[model samples]
Target: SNADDFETSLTELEPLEKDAYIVRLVFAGSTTTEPIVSSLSTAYDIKINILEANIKNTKNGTVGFLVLHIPYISSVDFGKFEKELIERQVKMEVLRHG
Candidate 1:
């Protein structure tokens, strides 16, 4: 299970930077989970850390909360990063942090 789970996580976290974190508040068991998470971290070359990853099964599907943080944003190109997510078929909403 670790292999599958970790591999899946890897596919989602590898591409993301060490600091780039994924914050998924709601998930419905999408196939794109891994890649989307991975690419973001890899793009920024940051270590992937899950601030929160909670999954709950529901009649509709699955729901959960996730949070990701990217340690190195200054070195990241916002436009390019955004484009990469698009290329990978991932959609994101940006929030400002203090």
Candidate 2:
């Protein structure tokens, strides 16, 4: 049955081993069907904890902007990932690292 498979979706990601990251995502475009939860799991060995989220209907369309707390991220993929995000114009602010 699909019941067993549904359990996998309910799985939660673990916290960071070291410091934590508090980031804000100002999405004024796609969001309703764009929940990138743990998508980086296959790419990076890290867990993503969504702290706060704000969704509102703007003149453009359905917009979503929120913050995420990435506990553990790899230095190897850090630069690559950061670069990718910037390319997409996803501004990020590293509040604190500790």
Candidate 3:
């Protein structure tokens, strides 16, 4: 019947947007990486509203992830963070929000 065929898409979800985007910061390195967030406020220039984070040591060495609420990043600033992330293979993605 009609209930048997149920499907939904982005359009079905309808209008969804936010002032900030949820980002997942993944990396494997030694030493403190929390400063990366500071750089967003000072060096790169961006808002700092961390949703949650977990960066600790394990059998795989210093490795973890951070979820941050990032505000607007200018094209010039984008050039900075993007280039650095690419070179280090830090791996960043928009997990939620537009």
Per-candidate clashes, comma-separated? 29, 0, 0
Put down candidate 3 lDDT per residue, 3-95, tens digits, no spaces: 233223222322334444556778787445665667557876677677566888776656887766666666576567757766766778765
Q: Model 2: residues >4 Å from true position, as ranges?
A: 1-19, 30-35, 57-64
All candidates in order of TM-score, best leading: 3, 2, 1
Error of 2 at 62 (Å): 5.1
Cα miss at 18, model 2 (Å)? 4.2
Candidate that beats the other on lDDT, 1 or 3, i.e. the better one: 3
The local distance difference test score of model 3 is 0.62
Cα RMSD of predicted structure 1: 10.1
Winning candidate number (lDDT) = 3
Tens digit of per-residue lDDT, candidate 2, span 19-64:
5555666555543414344454456777766665667866666466
**Weakest 10 consecutive residues, lDDT, candidate 3?**
2-11
Supply candidate 1's per-residue lDDT for 41: 65
- Whole-model lDDT per candidate: 0.52, 0.56, 0.62
Q: Judged by lDDT against the true structure, how good is candidate 1?
A: 0.52
Q: Record all residue pairs in model 3 with backbone atoms less than 3 Å apart, i.e. clashing.
A: none
